[PDB]
Design an enzyme around this catalytic site. Structure first.
Site, PDB file in Angstrom:
ATOM      1  N   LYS A 131     -15.226  -8.227  -7.363  1.00  0.00           N
ATOM      2  CA  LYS A 131     -14.324  -9.053  -8.161  1.00  0.00           C
ATOM      3  C   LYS A 131     -13.683 -10.143  -7.309  1.00  0.00           C
ATOM      4  O   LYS A 131     -13.604 -11.307  -7.722  1.00  0.00           O
ATOM      5  CB  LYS A 131     -13.252  -8.177  -8.805  1.00  0.00           C
ATOM      6  CG  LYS A 131     -12.214  -8.937  -9.608  1.00  0.00           C
ATOM      7  CD  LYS A 131     -12.580  -9.016 -11.074  1.00  0.00           C
ATOM      8  CE  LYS A 131     -11.749  -8.037 -11.887  1.00  0.00           C
ATOM      9  NZ  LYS A 131     -11.527  -8.498 -13.283  1.00  0.00           N
ATOM     10  N   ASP A 132     -13.241  -9.786  -6.106  1.00  0.00           N
ATOM     11  CA  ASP A 132     -12.646 -10.752  -5.194  1.00  0.00           C
ATOM     12  C   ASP A 132     -13.675 -11.748  -4.685  1.00  0.00           C
ATOM     13  O   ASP A 132     -13.341 -12.903  -4.419  1.00  0.00           O
ATOM     14  CB  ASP A 132     -12.001 -10.008  -4.037  1.00  0.00           C
ATOM     15  CG  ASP A 132     -10.693  -9.376  -4.419  1.00  0.00           C
ATOM     16  OD1 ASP A 132     -10.639  -8.638  -5.422  1.00  0.00           O
ATOM     17  OD2 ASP A 132      -9.723  -9.573  -3.679  1.00  0.00           O
TER      18      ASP A 132
ATOM     19  N   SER B 173      -0.604  -0.971  -6.279  1.00  0.00           N
ATOM     20  CA  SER B 173      -0.452  -2.157  -7.105  1.00  0.00           C
ATOM     21  C   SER B 173       0.090  -1.797  -8.484  1.00  0.00           C
ATOM     22  O   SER B 173       0.091  -0.637  -8.902  1.00  0.00           O
ATOM     23  CB  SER B 173      -1.785  -2.885  -7.246  1.00  0.00           C
ATOM     24  OG  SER B 173      -2.330  -3.181  -5.976  1.00  0.00           O
TER      25      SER B 173
ATOM     26  N   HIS C 204       0.809  -1.209   0.000  1.00  0.00           N
ATOM     27  CA  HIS C 204       0.000   0.000   0.000  1.00  0.00           C
ATOM     28  C   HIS C 204       0.844   1.262   0.000  1.00  0.00           C
ATOM     29  O   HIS C 204       0.373   2.301  -0.470  1.00  0.00           O
ATOM     30  CB  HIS C 204      -0.934   0.004   1.204  1.00  0.00           C
ATOM     31  CG  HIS C 204      -2.059  -0.972   1.089  1.00  0.00           C
ATOM     32  ND1 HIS C 204      -3.166  -0.932   1.907  1.00  0.00           N
ATOM     33  CD2 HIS C 204      -2.249  -2.012   0.245  1.00  0.00           C
ATOM     34  CE1 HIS C 204      -3.986  -1.913   1.577  1.00  0.00           C
ATOM     35  NE2 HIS C 204      -3.454  -2.583   0.572  1.00  0.00           N
TER      36      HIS C 204
ATOM     37  N   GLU D 147       4.824 -34.166  -0.680  1.00  0.00           N
ATOM     38  CA  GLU D 147       3.607 -33.641  -1.264  1.00  0.00           C
ATOM     39  C   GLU D 147       3.914 -33.018  -2.621  1.00  0.00           C
ATOM     40  O   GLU D 147       5.055 -32.665  -2.926  1.00  0.00           O
ATOM     41  CB  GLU D 147       2.965 -32.613  -0.337  1.00  0.00           C
ATOM     42  CG  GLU D 147       1.989 -33.201   0.669  1.00  0.00           C
ATOM     43  CD  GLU D 147       0.620 -33.484   0.074  1.00  0.00           C
ATOM     44  OE1 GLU D 147       0.546 -34.124  -0.994  1.00  0.00           O
ATOM     45  OE2 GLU D 147      -0.388 -33.063   0.679  1.00  0.00           O
TER      46      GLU D 147
END
Ligand SMILES: CCCCCCCCCCCCCCCCCC(=O)OC[C@H](COP(=O)([O-])OCC(O)COP(=O)([O-])OC[C@@H](COC(=O)CCCCCCCCCCCCCCCCC)OC(=O)CCCCCCCCCCCCCCCCC)OC(=O)CCCCCCCCCCCCCCCCC
Ligand SMILES: CCCCCCCCCCCCCCCCCC(=O)OC[C@H](COP(=O)([O-])OCC(O)COP(=O)([O-])OC[C@@H](COC(=O)CCCCCCCCCCCCCCCCC)OC(=O)CCCCCCCCCCCCCCCCC)OC(=O)CCCCCCCCCCCCCCCCC
Ligand SMILES: CCCCCCCCCCCCCCCCCC(=O)OC[C@H](COP(=O)([O-])OCC[N+](C)(C)C)OC(=O)CCCCCCCCCCCCCCCCC
Ligand SMILES: CCCCCCCCCCCCCCCCCC(=O)OC[C@H](COP(=O)([O-])OCC[N+](C)(C)C)OC(=O)CCCCCCCCCCCCCCCCC
Ligand SMILES: CCCCCCCCCCCCCCCCCC(=O)OC[C@H](COP(=O)(O)OCCN)OC(=O)CCCCCCCCCCCCCCCCC
Ligand SMILES: CCCCCCCCCCCCCCCCCC(=O)OC[C@H](COP(=O)(O)OCCN)OC(=O)CCCCCCCCCCCCCCCCC
Ligand code: HEC
Ligand code: HEM
Ligand code: HEM
Ligand code: HEM
Ligand code: HEM
Ligand code: FES
Lengths: 164, 379, 239, 52, 56, 110, 379
Positions: free
Chosen positions: G227-228, G205, G201, G271
């Site tokens: 959107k998220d 972005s 922040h 894994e």
């Protein structure tokens, strides 16, 4: 506006259904598992007990006594008053079935040697500490903390009693 | 070009919260405890984690795990008794912190006060659940009693207690979920402590006089860092005295007996920091009344900013208020002692009077006395 | 009702920095082995713990090898006895608590790993209990098989007199009088409950000396830093 | 990067800070030996080796 | 005064201050451990295992 | 200045000693406990298997093959492709016993 | 008179975080994975809690307790498999996030990129310990194989292993130790994620085009929250498909066998989200070199911001670098495939080629391609 908000409302009700199920998943997970709902659940007995005898059981990790309190014993425990006990408990008040007294069998007060299935004042007597017991599992001699604890027994029918 | 201490994002927060924070220059030693609690928190988070690496939460092996910690792990006993007596010291510092808040009128910082109440509730919960892990006699039976307490809640009460137990009585499931909740909770406490500090820093701090010290603030780093270091050294002195000289001084010996659910201990008192609450519960004959008074004893701290009527924020200039404050402290001590003692003839009445006096002082005596205070000062 | 409070005996390990008499620990272990181990246990304590506190390594080996312990399955899946080693805890006198309760009237002889740390009073309580048996006062009639001990809660223990005079033969040569036996067994049980006792007191000594060295110095630093403010002199010069 | 830091006065600054950096490294070495209780080195210092 | 010589020698530079602290850590640790252990063994002479191992 | 900084130096030395003797306290706590320091001093007779057969034991935390080797190997295993054979070893130095070979289970590949 | 949204301290922080934070207009779907990580984290913190509420940590009750959660706890299997496959979802989102940061040149945000590398290391360690927890054959043997790498470290190395093992082999001590560490670590991950969001922040972005978008900025709340939400719905679709329809798809069946130290499974594979690195481990016969390459395979992301030589920031307008990046992704997939297969022809030589090509692409091919790239555009 109605069409757009209808899309919003139907989305929200769908999410409400999904969230209710997702939360109930976890909440029911914290609740009693299957096993504790199988061994700690009711452990119904039968009529494998004759008159006078007390069939030993092991339910909820605690011994169970199902002594067949005969008529004579009911007479003695009804005659015996309540204030003589340290904790006043009338024979019929604690035992809703006079012929069958249901009592969890654990000597109170750190288990100092009782005498089981035989008693001076009844069917059990505990002489280590002043703890003489009644045939209805009531404290008789000495102010022991409590009588013999009675669980929640339910006589559904003949030879069918579900307890804790 | 610029100082990293006041230009770097993380360093900016650290600087504005611990280095260049303007703090009053006359805050007494009672303000050190806010540091100690935090340090205690760290210690509790620390030692407990090292306890988590050799403690296995299960009915058939919890007590054996703890005794293996104290008997076979390298210096396991140091960590274990550090943890127990550090929890006790945590509660001592918490009570002193709340006392400082009550005395010097710090509850006018309402956001911080309410966050503090939430932290207090969380800490009591954390300690109660933590006391269950050793799975001793007092552990098992105190957990049984305190969880059965919730049965007094109308309608949903029995379902609530059977949900908390994870079954029908305190057993394997309760132990495991108590361990998990005990692990999770102190981090929630840490987050709430950060929020507490954030709320506090916007209004500075309250000096003992209760007057705005905006004309006297001093940088935090040169002075209060060493002040709080000295305070933490003193607290470590006390804690290590407890750990290394009388470890189980503040503990029930019967907890060193594996939990036998067939034998009720002669005494079932909770930890020493809960008795003041527990006694309140034993005061009210009604079960639901008992639980409500139990909760309200802690919750009454929320009402304090509404019950402040005197025109002076502090208490140092209000003698009759000081007398009532110390009466309240003596009442709290009496409640602790009463909760420790059995519920018999000389103690029932004393506990009832102590609880009534505690509530009455907080709600009635102090506000009316502050009204008399203002009247005496011609304002 | 009522309760005897065990008088505070002047134990050698009572002072703030007074360790345990490890010779007394060595004698108390023998007292446990020959008398108390018949019906009690300290399952949390293994022969290995005795090394370096009350017995030497070879002596601990010899002590362990004098007893036979269950082991795991063979190649045939059976259970087989084998002599113990410095990894087997003290043998349980009764295979299961029900057998212990049945054999000793109806009372379970408590495990003594923590019997000093679990009883209100500590070594004083156990010492007074052992050396406190007496004929019951008049008006009290104990049922046959129970014994009157005032210090025991309820004043009626299911315990036969554990230690009479000259019970065993101390290897040291100290007379095995009842009081000596009780003192040695009590010290040993205190060690059993608190194996870190000696090291706890040692670390406490070092802690005391470090704080006595540090707290004055940190206080001096605090005064050093704050002396700017303590000597600060103000002045008001309004026009 | 390295083109900028390769200078006469830059090496001169390096020379100025050589003593402080080197004996900071000595500080670190002694602290590491102490905290770790490195017996391999501590067996040669006269008084301390008596501990082992 | 000696303290002036100490300040000019080992204390003026922060890094030399740290080196002095580090070496003092070694020697103080050894000396203090010796002293405290000796004091404890003196207080409880004849009770520790170290004092009775010889007869076995 | 020397007096003040000497006070500071002495308290820093005390703090260093305390910090060392507490962090080593915790780290040694995390190290192996005395119960497992009842360490791998394992025992047990070897003649169980009927020649040339491995018996697995749990001895330190990973398996240990205990085996009374075949009669062919006491006298001729050293002669089985002695050559160089990557790492060359013979039963005489592998085990002081002629027969009666013992070796931990961890493979050499991983 | 003011918004409590932008004046209340906590509400101010939330507002500047994800309500009124200026976000780029053209943020593609690849950024959603950011939140898809956090949500996964929350889910992982959630379900794990409800697992720790019925999971002991002793080797005599680890596997049995896991089977108890799966078979007896009401709806417990949902939580168990939700955790097991949410780990894979977490790592899929993590790898896609790292790929996004690499492709669009987001590593120019040095602080956020380094914090991301730290988060990657922490998440990988936490997942390793978690997979150790259920005490299956895969669990025990993978833990032994992975921890035995630290024996390669010179001098201290052996001691270090005996330190972490808490003894001489992965045993009772290590299981509980890993339980405690797996519990504590995700909260450290959460703290680091908060620091990461702070650092991001401070700059804002980066859009797909790689160019500063301070002119076309839109508020976060009305657009990117929904959107998220859509991104979270899609990720929940994938995760729920995995859990409900094919739970043991990404796992290994041998993990459903009680850990037996006296016998190993036919294959010892970790894994899936670790195989890409495990293959690199297998590439170099030198064990110490293998461990060093294992660490460098992740630490390369630290050097990645330095190696950036292109005048442009992203890969939107760099077709040659685009083919290079997809060569890298195919190489990682090849390493993942190689890790599963045993050490045999031709997997050995293919593994060496893939491991060489990975570092060759990252360290040499990409910077040289960028150097040719600038020359192809007059700069
Ligand atoms: C001599 C007769 C006894 C005097 C002390 C008892 C008493 O009632 O004193 C009242 C008397 C009057 O109080 P005051 O000076 O108006 O205000 C004291 C400050 O509010 C608060 O105190 P302060 O910040 O002015 O000074 C610190 C003080 C008090 O320190 C504290 O209160 C914090 C430590 C916990 C409580 C004390 C534990 C000992 O520390 C001590 O008195 C001794 C050192 C205690 C540990 C380090 C602190 O205070 C003192 O004599 C000293 C403070 C109380 C000590 C208890
Ligand atoms: C045509 C048939 C193949 C379509 C998929 C492969 C392809 O060439 O996609 C090109 C293109 C995605 O890449 P792009 O638009 O050239 O570059 C912008 C970014 O992809 C970012 O564009 P975006 O933010 O609109 O996200 C679009 C992306 C969304 O991708 C994701 O959400 C992540 C991947 C998992 C789903 O959809 C994809 O299909 C790409 C990932 C999966 C490829 C297979 O997708 C389509 O043309 C249609 C996508 C929807 C399915 C029909
Ligand atoms: C590198 C720092 C020193 C490491 C080391 O082993 O120091 C010796 C000391 C004591 O070991 P030591 O001196 O008995 O033997 C050192 C050599 N090894 C470890 C191979 C046996 O190390 C430790 O105390 C911990 C070492 C690991 C942590 C650093
Ligand atoms: C946590 C719970 C307990 C908390 C309290 C107990 C622990 C801390 C007590 C002491 C704290 C204050 C003193 C700490 C040392 C310090 O930095 O003092 C301030 C002082 C303030 O500076 P100073 O003015 O005293 O000294 C530096 C100035 N010259 C060089 C001129 C003397 O800090 C220093 O001296 C800086 C150097 C510190 C080096 C520390 C590491 C040395 C060993 C490395 C291996
Ligand atoms: C026992 C109490 C401590 C010993 C010292 C006596 C004492 O506390 O005196 C009161 C003290 C003096 O502080 P001051 O603000 O000067 O008081 C007004 C003076 N006219 O003022 C205070 O101590 C104020 C803080 C009291 C609340 C915190 C300590 C008690 C916590 C109990 C829980
Ligand atoms: C996904 C498959 C489809 C795909 O990637 O198509 C290419 C497309 C192009 O996106 P665009 O931003 O338009 O590129 C510039 C075009 N001139 O989309 C992209 O290039 C987006 C995909 C690359 C950037 C996001 C990161 C993806 C990482 C996937 C592998 C993760 C593991 C390896 C890396 C770590
Ligand atoms: C042959 C049997 C037997 C011998 C010998 C014996 N005990 Fe006991 N002990 C018991 C039994 C049975 C009880 C249970 C008494 C009760 O709970 O009412 C008991 C109780 C105790 C208690 C419980 C006290 C309390 O109230 O918590 C202690 C302490 C104790 N024994 C220690 C010893 C010591 C020390 C010795 C010998 C040095 C010893 N015992 C010898 C059988 C024995
Ligand atoms: C809020 C701070 C904490 C408080 C007040 C607290 C309180 C307690 C208390 C009173 C006990 C009982 C100790 C005993 O009877 O011997 C306990 C035990 C325990 N606590 Fe904590 N605790 C705290 C933080 C933690 C944390 C963060 C962990 C995990 C990392 C933890 C893990 C344990 C464990 C494993 C036990 C059982 C071992 C033991 O009883 O000592 N504690 N806690
Ligand atoms: C988790 C435990 C707690 C921690 C870590 C904590 C932390 C702190 C710290 C560090 C301070 C600043 C130092 C100081 O002013 O004394 C502070 C101030 C304060 N705390 Fe707490 N606190 C805790 C619990 C509480 C509780 C229970 C309350 C009361 C409900 C409370 C109310 C306050 C108030 C009112 C202040 C302001 C004091 C003033 O400036 O005058 N806190 N807290
Ligand atoms: C714990 C897992 C992680 C969480 C929760 C997390 C969280 C976030 C979030 C929410 C964002 C904003 C959304 C976005 O741009 O994607 C973000 C941005 C970013 N993260 Fe992460 N992250 C994680 C792991 C990583 C890793 C492993 C890296 C790489 C080392 C990384 C590097 C970045 C970068 C470079 C950005 C800025 C992207 C841009 O500006 O285009 N993060 N992080
Ligand atoms: C950082 C996020 C986390 C990741 C990636 C993660 C990953 C894993 C993995 C891969 C397993 C093994 C699953 C399997 O058995 O196949 C596991 C198990 C477990 N995790 Fe976590 N975990 C996370 C957070 C947590 C947290 C916060 C807790 C504690 C509240 C927790 C508690 C457990 C427990 C108790 C198990 C054992 C149950 C089981 O294996 O099924 N996890 N975790
Ligand atoms: S002995 Fe049975 S009740 Fe006291």
């Amino acid at each position: 506006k109605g069409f757009s908000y209808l899309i919003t409302a139907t989305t929200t009700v769908g999410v409400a259904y999904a969230a209710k199920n997702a939360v109930s998943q976890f909440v029911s997970s914290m609740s009693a598992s299957a096993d504790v709902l199988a061994m700690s659940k009711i452990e119904i007995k039968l009529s494998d007990i004759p008159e006078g005898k007390n069939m030993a059981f092991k339910w909820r990790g605690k011994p169970l006594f199902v002594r067949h309190r005969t008529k004579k014993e009911i007479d003695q425990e009804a005659a015996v008053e309540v204030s003589q006990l340290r904790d006043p408990q009338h024979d019929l008040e604690r035992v809703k079935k006079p012929e069958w007294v249901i009592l969890i069998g654990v000597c109170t007060h750190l288990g100092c040697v009782p005498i089981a299935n035989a008693g001076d004042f009844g069917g059990y007597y505990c002489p280590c500490h002043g703890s003489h017991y009644d045939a209805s599992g009531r404290i008789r001699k000495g102010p022991a903390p409590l009588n013999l604890e009675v669980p929640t027994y339910e006589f559904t029918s003949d030879d069918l009693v579900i307890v804790g | 070009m610029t100082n990293i201490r006041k230009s770097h994002p993380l360093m900016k927060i650290i600087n504005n919260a611990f280095i260049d924070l303007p703090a009053p220059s006359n805050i007494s030693s009672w303000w050190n405890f806010g540091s100690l609690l935090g340090i205690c928190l760290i210690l509790q988070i620390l030692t407990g984690l090292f306890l988590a690496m050799h403690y296995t939460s299960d009915t058939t092996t919890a007590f054996s795990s703890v005794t293996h910690i104290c008997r076979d792990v390298n210096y396991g006993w140091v960590i274990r008794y550090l943890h127990a007596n550090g929890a006790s010291m945590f509660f001592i510092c918490l009570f002193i912190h709340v006392g400082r808040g009550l005395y010097y009128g710090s509850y006018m910082f309402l956001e911080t006060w309410n966050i503090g109440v939430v932290l207090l509730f969380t800490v009591m919960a954390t300690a109660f659940m933590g006391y269950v892990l050793p799975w001793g006699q007092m552990s098992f039976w105190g957990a049984t009693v305190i969880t059965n307490l919730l049965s007094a809640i109308p309608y949903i009460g029995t379902d609530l207690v059977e949900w908390i137990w994870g079954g029908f009585s305190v057993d394997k499931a309760t132990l495991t979920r108590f361990f998990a909740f005990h692990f999770i909770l102190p981090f929630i406490i840490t987050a709430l402590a950060a929020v507490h500090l954030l709320f506090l820093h916007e209004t500075g701090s309250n000096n003992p006089t209760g007057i705005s010290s905006d004309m006297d603030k001093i940088p935090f780093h040169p002075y209060y860092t060493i002040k709080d270091i000295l305070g933490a050294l003193f607290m470590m002195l006390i804690l290590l005295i407890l750990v290394l000289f009388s470890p189980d001084l503040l503990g029930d010996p019967d907890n060193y007996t594996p939990a036998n659910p067939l034998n009720t201990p002669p005494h079932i008192k909770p930890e020493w920091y809960f008795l003041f609450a527990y006694a309140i519960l034993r005061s009210i004959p009604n079960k639901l009344g008992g639980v409500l008074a139990l909760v309200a004893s802690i919750l009454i701290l929320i009402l304090m900013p509404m019950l402040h009527t005197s025109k002076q924020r502090s208490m140092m200039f209000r003698p009759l208020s000081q007398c009532l404050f110390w009466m309240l402290v003596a009442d709290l001590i009496t409640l602790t002692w009463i909760g420790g003692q059995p519920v018999e003839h000389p103690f029932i009445i004393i506990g009832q009077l102590a609880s009534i006096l505690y509530f009455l002082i907080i709600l009635v005596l102090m506000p009316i006395t502050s009204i008399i205070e203002n009247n005496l000062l011609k304002w | 009702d009522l309760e005897l409070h065990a008088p505070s005996y002047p134990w050698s390990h009572r002072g703030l920095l007074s360790s345990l008499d490890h010779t007394s620990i060595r004698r108390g272990f023998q007292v446990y082995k020959q008398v108390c181990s018949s019906c009690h246990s300290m399952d949390y304590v293994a022969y290995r713990h005795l090394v370096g506190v009350c017995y030497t390594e070879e002596e601990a080996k010899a002590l362990a090898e004098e007893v036979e312990v269950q082991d795991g399955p063979n190649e045939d899946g059976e259970m087989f006895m084998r002599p113990g080693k410095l990894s087997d805890y003290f043998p349980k006198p009764y295979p299961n608590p029900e057998a212990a309760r049945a054999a000793n009237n109806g009372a379970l002889p408590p495990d003594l790993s923590y019997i000093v740390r679990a009883r209100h009073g500590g070594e004083d309580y156990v010492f007074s209990l052992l050396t406190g048996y007496c004929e019951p006062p008049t008006g009290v009639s104990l049922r046959e098989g129970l014994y009157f001990n005032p210090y025991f809660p309820g004043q009626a223990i299911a315990m036969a007199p554990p230690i009479y005079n000259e019970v065993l033969e101390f290897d040291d040569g100290t007379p095995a009088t009842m009081s000596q036996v009780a003192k040695d067994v009590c010290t040993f049980l205190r060690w059993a409950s608190e194996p870190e006792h000696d090291h706890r007191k040692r670390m406490g000594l070092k802690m005391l000396m470090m704080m006595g060295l540090l707290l004055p110095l940190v206080y001096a630093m605090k005064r050093h830093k704050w002396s700017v403010l303590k000597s600060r002199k103000l002045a008001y010069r309004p026009p | 990067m390295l083109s900028r830091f390769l200078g006469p006065r830059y090496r001169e600054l390096a020379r100025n800070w050589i003593p402080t950096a080197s004996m900071w490294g000595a500080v670190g070495a002694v602290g590491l030996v102490w905290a770790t209780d490195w017996r391999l080195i501590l067996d040669w210092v006269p008084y301390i080796n008596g501990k082992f | 005064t000696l303290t002036a010589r100490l300040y000019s020698l080992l204390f003026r530079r922060t890094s030399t201050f740290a080196l002095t602290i580090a070496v003092g850590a070694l020697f103080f640790e050894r000396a203090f451990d010796q002293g405290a252990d000796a004091i404890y063994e003196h207080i409880n002479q004849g009770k520790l295992w170290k004092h009775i191992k010889h007869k076995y």
